[PDB]
Ligand binder design. Sequence first.
Ligand code: OLA
Length: 133
Amino acid sequence: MVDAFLGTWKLVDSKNFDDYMKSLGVGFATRQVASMTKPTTIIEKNGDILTLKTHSTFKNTEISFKLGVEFDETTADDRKVKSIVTLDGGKLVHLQKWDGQETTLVRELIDGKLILTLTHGTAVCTRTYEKEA
Ligand SMILES: CCCCCCCC/C=C\CCCCCCCC(=O)O
């Protein structure tokens, strides 16, 4: 189930993240810095409680959740959202809802890489992470 996602991952490719940030209303100065930032994502579990840390030189976040159980979240860009993370088609699917808006953060493993697809509005961003050697 979730075990192949666990570990420490580093960003190695980003496509359309600016589109995604712009769609969310992120200001230009934050987008500028974010476009040059390479986060480390750490995914850990304790039982069915997962913890997902995103660390960087700019912003840091951490969430803990039970798979399939809604949780409150405050995102890196300061949105207060209602979230749920599940496993779907082998993908770790994180849905955020706020003010009637939806975004998904979908993680999948392809050839050992973790591919994070971020969708909001029409914007679709694909970011690739590799396991810390
Ligand atoms: C915590 C570091 C996140 C990446 C740099 C800061 C981005 C700030 C602006 C928009 C946040 C959008 C929602 C979170 C995107 C996470 C991307 C990722 O995990 O690679």
